[PDB]
Amino acid sequence: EISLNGYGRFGLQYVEDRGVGLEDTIISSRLRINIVGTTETDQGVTFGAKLRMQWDDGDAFAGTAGNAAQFWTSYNGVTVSVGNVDTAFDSVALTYDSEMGYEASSFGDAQSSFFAYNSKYDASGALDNYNGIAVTYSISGVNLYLSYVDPDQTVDSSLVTEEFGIAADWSNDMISLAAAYTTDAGGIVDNDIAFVGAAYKFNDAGTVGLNWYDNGLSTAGDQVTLYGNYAFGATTVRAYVSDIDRAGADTAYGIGADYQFAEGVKVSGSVQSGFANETVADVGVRFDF
Amino acid sequence: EISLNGYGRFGLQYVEDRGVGLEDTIISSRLRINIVGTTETDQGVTFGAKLRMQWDDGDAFAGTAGNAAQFWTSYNGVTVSVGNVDTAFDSVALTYDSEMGYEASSFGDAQSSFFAYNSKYDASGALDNYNGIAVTYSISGVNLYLSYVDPDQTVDSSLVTEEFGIAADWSNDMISLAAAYTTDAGGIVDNDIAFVGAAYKFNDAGTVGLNWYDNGLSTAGDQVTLYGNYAFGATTVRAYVSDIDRAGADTAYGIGADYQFAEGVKVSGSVQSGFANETVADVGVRFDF
Amino acid sequence: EISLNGYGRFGLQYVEDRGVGLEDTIISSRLRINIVGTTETDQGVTFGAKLRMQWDDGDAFAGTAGNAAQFWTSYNGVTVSVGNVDTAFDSVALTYDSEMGYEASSFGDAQSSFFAYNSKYDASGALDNYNGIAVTYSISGVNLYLSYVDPDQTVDSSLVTEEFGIAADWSNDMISLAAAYTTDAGGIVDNDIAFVGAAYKFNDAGTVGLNWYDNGLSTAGDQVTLYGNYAFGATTVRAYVSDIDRAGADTAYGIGADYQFAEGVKVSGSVQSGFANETVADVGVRFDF
């Protein structure tokens, strides 16, 4: 069995003083197609592989290709995956819940480098032998994530730096907890990052959360992000503030809205201010097919 | 929802004195696959995106990839599209109705340069930031086309040349009219081209038309094409003659046949003579799946 | 109509002293997707085209693309195909029946060069104009294969070397015969190879065969391969020995197992010894979706 899913999204992307001779506002857009092949068995074991074809405005050659394969085996809630795998740091909950706009962005996201699912190919050749192993398990309420990544599996281990990450989240009807730890993130020695987050669903239509990060060797340093959103029926209001230890940095913040036009169609917009006092705004549509 | 459609076609392509050391006749063939994702809503609005993977004999690397995405929104007969869009000049009626053979060709087609849907990627990098906006509307019988194209949307407007094109066609049961105008066609300054065409369906199985072109900065100059076809049940006979103002040019002409083998399978052939006295012939099959 | 089929496979690949500074064991894996478009007619004729997207661990750019198209027409058991076609030498029976492991390998396979379906693109540019014609016909029990391949169809014939191959196999319930002949294999002049094989199904769960090869200009020389397998319900045991005329060569051999975990899921493993005394072992899974 092979199924095809994906999405499209487009709108206006603005960034003040984007560059001399350059247009501040452009029409950013993206097309994503996921190709998933699965083989189910009566022994209760599922085999699957997926491939992704994704194009973005600006992409080289005005072309679209597939990325590197991912394979997995699920059984009794346990899933082992190989190849181009999702990572623990990128997989945990709450960590990206401050994002807004149609391009789902936020300076409130972690400011560190770490491996995460590669959607496109890479011309540099850097990923040619990038292979990983990931494991997840859901013990009702609790979620476990373990990922191991070798940027070049053909070379003798001791010669390369592997990334290892552990992560877990839990959640009842009103409180949520999440923690994650990754050593040698992004294959960079001593680049040990960490996340700890908590959220409170102070109602059905609203939630306030707090994320704290240890950005490893990032010049950003430790960082805390405070966000919240509220749902007035079909439209959602979002806001957040973020701070990093880097000297002289500005407090990052953003305010935005979501409008569920229909099932599958979502209109979003936002205005954000980065740590270097950058100003960015967006408004677009996203449709899932 | 994601649907896959497309077609295949192959046969013999002949061109007299194709080049020293080169074979005049080769087996030309093409595979085209369209990937269309759509999201319908009960509000009566449709969202969609499409991608194309097309290979042609001769293609570099003996490979096939996807091109740059196209997105659109339809509502009440009005459709707005973004990205790799169809253009007014390329979209109007009658303009390509003189073509024949399995590769659908004719020296009777307009001899000017202008933007039109890009089916493949482009290694030059020329299309990396090529973005367009197109609008069409059907007021029963009449068809409106408007397209705006910026070959590099990242650069400040005033620095690049955009193509703008308007076009409209109308048609009852026996008469058809079509006109089109595009300024700075193909992004070339002062390259303003125009088309005007009329056709008469002098019966159910036959039609005679006349197309006049203003090829902008093309050395071809103004051009008039006269074509006609007749259907004897399953086989269609086609013919045409074309003239351009370029000095010393030859009158272009071609005679060909279509044979509807089945629904979806079409056999075609033709012999044509170009303005530079080139001789070309073809015979092949085309199947839509 | 367009259908999507394919498979995924992964496991451990071992090869003793794979190279200085290199890891002997790696996780080899593959994803294959076949895109097939067909157009059926009530005249009893079928038109089709297929494309392949296949990724392998190690692939450049960590990307995946499509290869060069193949088209065909089937009628009354006769099938004519064009473009990237399957060849007679690669298509006959018994010739690859000694292979084992999840990567289906065997030093017992023919040691000659010859054209065969190209699954991926080729950066060298070598296949840009590689076009072929193949014909097969099944006269109940007997199978005929004819293939003609021109590595560069644009160039004048006399300037390039074409590969031509004939092949046929037959088979009742317990005996099987197969022969094949290809001249200028792989487009190499005087590289005439041949195969002759016979197999006996000495039971429902077992088979012993013998393949003899004339490897044309290969330094391997003539070669004979002896293989056999036995099925104990769900697990299959395989073994083989191979010899070539090349001076000082070692006798190649391998022993392996297959385990049909479910319909579509197959676990395999093997240990093999090459003619140059190479040691290789593998164990993996393959799932068809």
mmCIF file of C-alpha atoms in Angstrom, chain A residues 4-10 18 21-31 33-34 53 55-65 261-265 285 287-289, chain B residues 1-2 4 35 37-41 43 45 47-51 53 65-69 71-73 82 120-123 125 127-129 131 133 153-157 159:
data_model
loop_
_atom_site.group_PDB
_atom_site.id
_atom_site.type_symbol
_atom_site.label_atom_id
_atom_site.label_comp_id
_atom_site.label_asym_id
_atom_site.label_seq_id
_atom_site.Cartn_x
_atom_site.Cartn_y
_atom_site.Cartn_z
ATOM 1 C CA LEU A 4 0.206 10.273 -0.884
ATOM 2 C CA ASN A 5 -0.383 13.192 1.464
ATOM 3 C CA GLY A 6 0.982 16.704 1.762
ATOM 4 C CA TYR A 7 0.164 20.385 1.727
ATOM 5 C CA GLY A 8 0.507 23.721 0.007
ATOM 6 C CA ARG A 9 0.916 27.165 1.506
ATOM 7 C CA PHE A 10 1.470 30.687 0.191
ATOM 8 C CA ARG A 18 15.925 42.660 3.802
ATOM 9 C CA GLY A 21 18.686 46.294 -3.860
ATOM 10 C CA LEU A 22 16.366 43.601 -2.516
ATOM 11 C CA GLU A 23 12.599 43.650 -2.132
ATOM 12 C CA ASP A 24 11.456 43.583 1.509
ATOM 13 C CA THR A 25 8.242 41.771 0.626
ATOM 14 C CA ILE A 26 8.058 38.665 -1.536
ATOM 15 C CA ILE A 27 5.527 35.894 -2.138
ATOM 16 C CA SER A 28 6.853 32.939 -0.166
ATOM 17 C CA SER A 29 5.263 29.581 -0.939
ATOM 18 C CA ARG A 30 5.761 25.878 -0.404
ATOM 19 C CA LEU A 31 4.581 22.554 -1.772
ATOM 20 C CA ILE A 33 4.338 15.831 -0.850
ATOM 21 C CA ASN A 34 4.852 12.783 1.339
ATOM 22 C CA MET A 53 9.369 15.850 -2.342
ATOM 23 C CA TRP A 55 9.805 22.694 -3.187
ATOM 24 C CA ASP A 56 10.228 26.201 -1.777
ATOM 25 C CA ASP A 57 10.265 29.551 -3.530
ATOM 26 C CA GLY A 58 13.872 30.364 -4.289
ATOM 27 C CA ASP A 59 15.002 26.747 -4.629
ATOM 28 C CA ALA A 60 17.892 26.150 -7.009
ATOM 29 C CA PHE A 61 17.168 25.089 -10.599
ATOM 30 C CA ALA A 62 13.465 25.809 -10.098
ATOM 31 C CA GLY A 63 13.248 22.070 -9.533
ATOM 32 C CA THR A 64 11.961 19.475 -7.092
ATOM 33 C CA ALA A 65 13.414 16.091 -6.116
ATOM 34 C CA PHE A 261 -11.373 28.856 7.338
ATOM 35 C CA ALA A 262 -12.363 25.208 6.933
ATOM 36 C CA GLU A 263 -11.152 21.729 7.740
ATOM 37 C CA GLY A 264 -7.746 21.710 6.103
ATOM 38 C CA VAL A 265 -7.577 25.399 5.187
ATOM 39 C CA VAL A 285 -2.816 30.371 3.516
ATOM 40 C CA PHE A 287 -4.170 23.886 2.709
ATOM 41 C CA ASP A 288 -3.727 20.201 3.498
ATOM 42 C CA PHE A 289 -4.614 17.672 0.831
ATOM 43 C CA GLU B 1 -6.918 14.621 -2.008
ATOM 44 C CA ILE B 2 -4.065 13.959 -4.432
ATOM 45 C CA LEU B 4 -2.101 11.535 -10.589
ATOM 46 C CA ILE B 35 0.625 15.500 -9.440
ATOM 47 C CA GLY B 37 -3.313 18.181 -4.668
ATOM 48 C CA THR B 38 -6.701 19.755 -3.952
ATOM 49 C CA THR B 39 -8.549 20.837 -0.834
ATOM 50 C CA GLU B 40 -12.267 21.476 -1.267
ATOM 51 C CA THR B 41 -14.388 23.355 1.270
ATOM 52 C CA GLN B 43 -17.737 27.355 1.577
ATOM 53 C CA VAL B 45 -13.771 27.541 -2.366
ATOM 54 C CA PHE B 47 -7.480 25.138 -3.002
ATOM 55 C CA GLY B 48 -4.971 23.320 -5.150
ATOM 56 C CA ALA B 49 -1.345 22.869 -6.060
ATOM 57 C CA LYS B 50 0.187 20.816 -8.860
ATOM 58 C CA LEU B 51 3.637 19.556 -9.732
ATOM 59 C CA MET B 53 7.551 15.397 -13.608
ATOM 60 C CA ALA B 65 12.689 15.534 -11.548
ATOM 61 C CA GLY B 66 9.859 17.845 -10.569
ATOM 62 C CA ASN B 67 9.462 21.474 -11.648
ATOM 63 C CA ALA B 68 8.481 24.563 -9.644
ATOM 64 C CA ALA B 69 5.097 24.484 -7.907
ATOM 65 C CA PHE B 71 -0.905 27.055 -6.428
ATOM 66 C CA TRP B 72 -4.424 28.325 -7.063
ATOM 67 C CA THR B 73 -7.775 29.257 -5.503
ATOM 68 C CA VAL B 82 0.587 31.832 -8.047
ATOM 69 C CA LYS B 120 10.939 21.195 -16.185
ATOM 70 C CA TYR B 121 13.596 22.606 -13.907
ATOM 71 C CA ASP B 122 16.246 24.920 -15.367
ATOM 72 C CA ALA B 123 19.955 24.359 -14.676
ATOM 73 C CA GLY B 125 19.356 29.245 -12.451
ATOM 74 C CA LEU B 127 13.974 30.536 -12.938
ATOM 75 C CA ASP B 128 15.126 30.211 -9.294
ATOM 76 C CA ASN B 129 13.042 33.264 -8.312
ATOM 77 C CA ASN B 131 7.236 34.037 -9.679
ATOM 78 C CA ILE B 133 0.291 35.795 -10.680
ATOM 79 C CA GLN B 153 10.866 38.638 -7.389
ATOM 80 C CA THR B 154 13.634 39.008 -4.805
ATOM 81 C CA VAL B 155 15.183 41.951 -6.622
ATOM 82 C CA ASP B 156 13.743 45.468 -6.401
ATOM 83 C CA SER B 157 10.968 45.805 -9.025
ATOM 84 C CA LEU B 159 15.485 46.701 -11.555
#
